[PDB]
Structure formats: C-alpha cells, structure tokens
Design an enzyme around this catalytic site. Structure first.
Site, mmCIF file in Angstrom:
data_model
loop_
_atom_site.group_PDB
_atom_site.id
_atom_site.type_symbol
_atom_site.label_atom_id
_atom_site.label_comp_id
_atom_site.label_asym_id
_atom_site.label_seq_id
_atom_site.Cartn_x
_atom_site.Cartn_y
_atom_site.Cartn_z
ATOM 1 N N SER A 95 0.777 -1.174 0.339
ATOM 2 C CA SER A 95 0.079 0.331 -0.179
ATOM 3 C C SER A 95 1.099 1.150 -0.236
ATOM 4 O O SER A 95 1.933 1.194 0.722
ATOM 5 C CB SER A 95 -1.062 -0.113 1.217
ATOM 6 O OG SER A 95 -1.650 -1.267 1.794
ATOM 7 N N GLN A 97 1.670 4.737 1.621
ATOM 8 C CA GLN A 97 1.552 4.601 3.136
ATOM 9 C C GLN A 97 2.106 6.599 3.344
ATOM 10 O O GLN A 97 3.155 6.853 1.822
ATOM 11 C CB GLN A 97 1.774 4.435 3.588
ATOM 12 C CG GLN A 97 1.863 2.956 3.509
ATOM 13 C CD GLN A 97 2.095 2.299 4.527
ATOM 14 O OE1 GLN A 97 3.134 1.871 5.820
ATOM 15 N NE2 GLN A 97 2.176 0.630 4.533
ATOM 16 N N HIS A 99 2.906 8.814 6.756
ATOM 17 C CA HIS A 99 3.144 9.041 8.303
ATOM 18 C C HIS A 99 3.399 10.033 8.641
ATOM 19 O O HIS A 99 3.969 11.408 8.623
ATOM 20 C CB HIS A 99 4.423 8.864 8.654
ATOM 21 C CG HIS A 99 5.539 7.450 8.197
ATOM 22 N ND1 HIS A 99 3.854 6.431 8.198
ATOM 23 C CD2 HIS A 99 6.173 6.536 7.587
ATOM 24 C CE1 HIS A 99 4.575 4.583 7.972
ATOM 25 N NE2 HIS A 99 5.601 4.884 7.624
ATOM 26 N N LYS A 132 8.226 9.969 13.605
ATOM 27 C CA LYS A 132 9.307 8.869 13.606
ATOM 28 C C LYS A 132 10.012 8.398 12.143
ATOM 29 O O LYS A 132 9.214 8.112 11.455
ATOM 30 C CB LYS A 132 10.228 8.081 15.167
ATOM 31 C CG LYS A 132 9.318 7.916 16.183
ATOM 32 C CD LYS A 132 8.185 7.197 16.819
ATOM 33 C CE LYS A 132 7.881 6.744 15.630
ATOM 34 N NZ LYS A 132 6.260 7.702 15.455
ATOM 35 N N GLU A 134 11.919 6.923 9.144
ATOM 36 C CA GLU A 134 12.019 5.522 8.721
ATOM 37 C C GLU A 134 12.775 5.233 8.363
ATOM 38 O O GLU A 134 12.795 5.925 6.815
ATOM 39 C CB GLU A 134 10.673 4.371 8.067
ATOM 40 C CG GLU A 134 10.618 3.683 7.900
ATOM 41 C CD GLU A 134 8.998 3.591 7.377
ATOM 42 O OE1 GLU A 134 8.365 3.610 6.840
ATOM 43 O OE2 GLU A 134 8.412 3.064 8.175
ATOM 44 N N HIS A 255 5.107 7.127 0.081
ATOM 45 C CA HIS A 255 6.225 6.016 -0.081
ATOM 46 C C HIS A 255 5.429 4.475 -0.733
ATOM 47 O O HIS A 255 4.020 4.714 0.178
ATOM 48 C CB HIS A 255 7.027 6.021 0.642
ATOM 49 C CG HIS A 255 7.245 6.224 2.155
ATOM 50 N ND1 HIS A 255 6.014 6.838 3.394
ATOM 51 C CD2 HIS A 255 6.917 5.094 2.795
ATOM 52 C CE1 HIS A 255 6.249 6.177 4.498
ATOM 53 N NE2 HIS A 255 6.176 4.813 4.430
ATOM 54 N N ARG A 274 -2.981 5.392 4.774
ATOM 55 C CA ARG A 274 -3.252 5.113 3.249
ATOM 56 C C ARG A 274 -3.279 5.998 2.336
ATOM 57 O O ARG A 274 -4.320 6.445 2.316
ATOM 58 C CB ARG A 274 -4.251 3.687 3.123
ATOM 59 C CG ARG A 274 -2.824 2.656 4.008
ATOM 60 C CD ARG A 274 -3.695 1.213 3.814
ATOM 61 N NE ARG A 274 -4.844 1.085 5.697
ATOM 62 C CZ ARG A 274 -5.623 1.420 5.913
ATOM 63 N NH1 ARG A 274 -6.925 2.256 5.539
ATOM 64 N NH2 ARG A 274 -6.404 1.171 7.275
ATOM 65 N N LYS A 280 -8.970 -1.096 1.872
ATOM 66 C CA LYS A 280 -9.428 -0.261 2.370
ATOM 67 C C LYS A 280 -10.052 1.029 2.140
ATOM 68 O O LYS A 280 -9.618 2.166 1.132
ATOM 69 C CB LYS A 280 -8.398 -0.445 3.674
ATOM 70 C CG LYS A 280 -7.482 -1.571 4.781
ATOM 71 C CD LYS A 280 -7.450 -1.630 5.443
ATOM 72 C CE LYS A 280 -6.941 -2.969 6.328
ATOM 73 N NZ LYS A 280 -7.585 -3.617 6.391
HETATM 74 O O1 LIG Z 1 7.659 3.046 13.236
HETATM 75 P P1 LIG Z 1 7.923 4.892 12.585
HETATM 76 O O2 LIG Z 1 9.589 4.724 13.218
HETATM 77 O O3 LIG Z 1 7.415 5.627 13.316
HETATM 78 O O4 LIG Z 1 8.166 4.210 11.351
HETATM 79 C C1 LIG Z 1 7.115 4.194 10.346
HETATM 80 C C2 LIG Z 1 6.734 5.908 10.145
HETATM 81 O O5 LIG Z 1 5.181 5.626 10.378
HETATM 82 C C3 LIG Z 1 5.535 7.043 12.065
HETATM 83 O O6 LIG Z 1 5.340 6.514 13.549
HETATM 84 C C4 LIG Z 1 3.888 7.486 11.682
HETATM 85 O O7 LIG Z 1 4.239 9.504 12.159
HETATM 86 C C5 LIG Z 1 6.615 7.648 11.658
HETATM 87 O O8 LIG Z 1 7.821 8.410 12.561
HETATM 88 C C6 LIG Z 1 7.676 6.539 10.427
HETATM 89 O O9 LIG Z 1 8.404 7.034 9.839
HETATM 90 ZN ZN LIG Z 2 6.655 3.749 5.842
#
Ligand SMILES: O=P(O)(O)OC[C@H]1O[C@](O)(CO)[C@@H](O)[C@@H]1O
Ligand SMILES: [Zn+2]
Length: 391
Positions: A95, A97, A99, A132, A134, A255, A274, A280
């Site tokens: 999917s 996504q 964040h 955070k 990734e 991404h 998503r 979904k």
């Molecule tokens: O588990 P991480 O480090 O958060 O990576 C998945 C993503 O989802 C999030 O928690 C959503 O804010 C981001 O912090 C992160 O880029």
């Molecule tokens: Zn991601």
C-alpha cells in the site's frame, strides 16, 4: 552470556515471498508459507528471544534490567528498546503510505484514544503521539515509490492521460502544489463510471507508452487492477534501489514498497495513513491534511552514507536509532556503542568475540549486545549491519 544470538519472528503476511528468506539465508520454510517480515527487536506483539539457559523474551530480559541492557542514555530518553529492525520481503506491491508529522500524530493518537479504539485494532491508524524516522536499505534490487516528482516531470507524465479526469487537465493548466493537492484527492475519490473511465484512459496509455514508470504501473495493475493508485507512479518518484543503497522516509510523504528484499529500521509503534493500492477505505480529507504537496528531486532521494574506516554510517536526523554497515576482515575490528545493539550478518560470515566468548553469525543471523557488553570484536568476511543508538 555477553553476546546473545537472537531467535527472531517471521511474520507470514500474504504479500511475503515464499522463497526469499530461504534463498538468501537458508531459513527453513517446508510448508512454503509466504514470509513477509523477519523481526529483530523487542516488540510486545512478537519479541525476539534469547536462550543461557532457557528461551526468554528479549523484551522481558530488557525489562528486568533496563539500564544495563539499554544503557543510561536510552533507559532515560526512551524507557525501552527504541527501534525495531526488519528484513522485508515484498513479493507483491504494498500500500501507499503516509506517516503524519509530530503535531498531527499527537492529535490522531489522541483522537483514536478518546474514541476508545484498542491500540491493536485494525481500525487503529495512530499508535504513537510522535513522528519518527524510517530507513529502508536494499538487500536485493528494491522497487519503490517515494515522494512527489518535480512538477515538470509530473506534467510530462500526465500528458498521455490528460483526458482521464478533469482534475488532471486542471493540474496541467497550472502545475502547482494546490492543484497537485486537488489532483491527488480527486483521483483517490473517483467513483463508479468516473473511476472506470479514468482507468480505461490509463490502460490505453499502458499500450502506447514504454519504459518507466509505465512498466511499474503495468506490474502494479496485476495486483490492483481497480485501484486509483495506478496513477501514483505518474505523481511519485519510482526508484529502483541497488543493493546497499538506502532511503529515509520523511513525514507527510507518500511512499510504497513494490518489490524486493530490504532491511528496515523503524520505531516499534507507528502511524499510517493509506493513499492507494489498498482495498481499505481511505479518509481523504485526513490524508490530504497530512500530506505535503512539494516535489522531491530524484537526486535527493537516497540517504548519503558516511564511511569511516571499516564503518559506513547512514546518518539519521533522529535520536531514536542509528544504522551502520561494517566491512569484516580476518583481522578483528572493534564494534562499540553506548547503547544496546543488534548485529545482523548481511553476507559472508561473522565471528563475534567478547573476551572468551565467540559467536558465529551466518548470513541472515543476528545477535543482541547489551549496552554493558560493549565493545565486541568482529572478524570474518562480508558485512555486518548494526542498529543501535548514538546518544
Ligand atoms: O516506526 P516509525 O519509526 O515511526 O516508522 C514508520 C513511520 O510511522 C510514523 O510513526 C508516523 O508518524 C513515523 O514516525 C514513521 O516514519
Ligand atoms: Zn513508511
């Protein structure tokens, strides 16, 4: 023991490769289940285990001894192992996504909490009041999308499908962020004959266009033939990572992982909205409110690592975790850190030594090193990947 060889969880999600972990690392799969993720860490839903002893959860082991295993820095900043380290095996396209950023993560986390949505319910999108980092690192050639293309690249790519939807014509007329935003929301919201008409136009293009990103659209369409996300490779950078290349996945940025095997470093708890390539239901207003409609030039997609001696660090703008690769030689090198670490053999073979204890890691195998057991000496051939904390 000073160094603890890990027993790791394999998540058999349906999109996983039935062969990858076996081919690469000789991980047993007699039933030929799809093997989607290999987990190295202390996630409460499936912690790695250590033996010494009987088998115990790494999470339980850390919990009984936080400062000694995590180190003071981490025990005090995070109160737990602040990273989850995965091998990802994408046999099918996954999917798209997004964040959310720090502010919006706090809000959605609180919204879902106030609504009383269990933290591990499928309806749950926000599992952390924070954003955070990734990091994805290619082990085999890795196909993905990441971030919006430069506006002029999108214009060029949408021309052949200008008649698919008025939103596309609208954007071509004035290719800016606002109309890109409107285009993105319009595509996702297409319904019935409006949707099928747009997809028909795109399909015809797939017959008169060559090369990327048309080829990716064709690959994706085999799994998501009725998805408005088929238009996404025209809006987002399609990237093919060579092994050893990596990308940082920024907040508010669409991404998707499309094919291949990769290491991924993340937090235990994340937030996911998503944006296509999913059956979904998507809350479009919320998605759009959490996306940043700014182009990201292809030359800025890969994280540029830093080589120092045998170490190749992948600098991360975050305190939560750090990631480096270590070239092994027959002469020992010292691998030290002020935190817990997980060491994973990428290729070759690693011998880890701590005083009298020796630990062999063949490719695909990993070990946990408590903060109080740093440093360890490593030798062998190939490369060792390390996740740890720089603080
Ligand atoms: O588990 P991480 O480090 O958060 O990576 C998945 C993503 O989802 C999030 O928690 C959503 O804010 C981001 O912090 C992160 O880029
Ligand atoms: Zn991601």
């Amino acid at each position: 023991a000073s160094m603890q060889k890990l027993i790791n969880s394999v998540q058999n999600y349906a999109w996983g490769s039935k062969t990858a972990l076996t081919e690469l690392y000789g991980i047993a799969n007699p039933q030929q289940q799809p093997m989607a993720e290999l987990w190295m860490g202390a996630h409460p839903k499936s912690s790695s285990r250590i033996t010494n002893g009987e088998t115990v959860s790494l999470r339980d082991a850390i919990e009984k001894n936080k400062t000694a295993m995590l180190g003071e820095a981490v025990a005090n900043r995070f109160g737990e192992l602040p990273f989850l380290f995965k091998v990802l095996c994408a046999a099918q396209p996954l999917s798209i996504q997004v964040h959310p950023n720090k502010r919006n993560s706090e809000i959605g986390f609180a919204k879902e909490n106030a609504a009383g949505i269990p933290m591990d319910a499928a309806e749950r999108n926000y599992k952390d009041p924070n954003h955070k980092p990734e990091l994805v690192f290619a082990l085999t050639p890795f196909l993905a999308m990441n971030a919006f293309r430069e506006f002029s690249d999108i214009v060029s790519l949408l021309q052949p499908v200008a008649g698919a939807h008025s939103a596309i014509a609208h954007f071509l007329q004035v290719p800016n962020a606002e109309r890109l935003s409107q285009l993105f929301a319009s595509l996702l919201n297409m319904q019935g004959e409006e949707k099928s008409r747009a997809l028909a136009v795109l399909k015809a293009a797939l017959n008169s266009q060559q090369g990327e990103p048309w080829q990716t659209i064709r690959v994706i369409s085999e799994y998501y033939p009725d998805d408005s996300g088929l238009f996404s490779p025209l809006l987002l950078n399609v990237v093919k990572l060579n092994p050893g290349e990596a990308m940082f996945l920024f907040a508010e940025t669409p991404h998707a992982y499309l094919q291949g095997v990769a290491l991924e470093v993340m937090a235990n708890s994340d937030n996911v909205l998503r944006a296509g390539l999913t059956p979904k239901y998507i809350d479009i207003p919320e998605l759009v409110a959490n996306v940043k409609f700014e182009p990201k030039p292809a030359g800025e997609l890969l994280t540029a690592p830093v080589k120092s001696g045998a170490e190749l660090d992948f600098p991360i703008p975050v305190d939560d975790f750090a990631f480096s690769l270590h070239d092994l030689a027959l002469q020992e090198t010292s691998i030290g850190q002020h935190s817990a670490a997980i060491l994973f053999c990428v290729e070759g073979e690693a011998v880890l030594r701590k005083d009298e204890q020796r630990l062999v890691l063949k490719p695909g195998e990993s070990a946990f090193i408590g903060a109080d057991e740093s440093p360890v000496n490593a030798s062998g051939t190939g490369r060792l990947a390390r996740v740890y904390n720089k603080l």
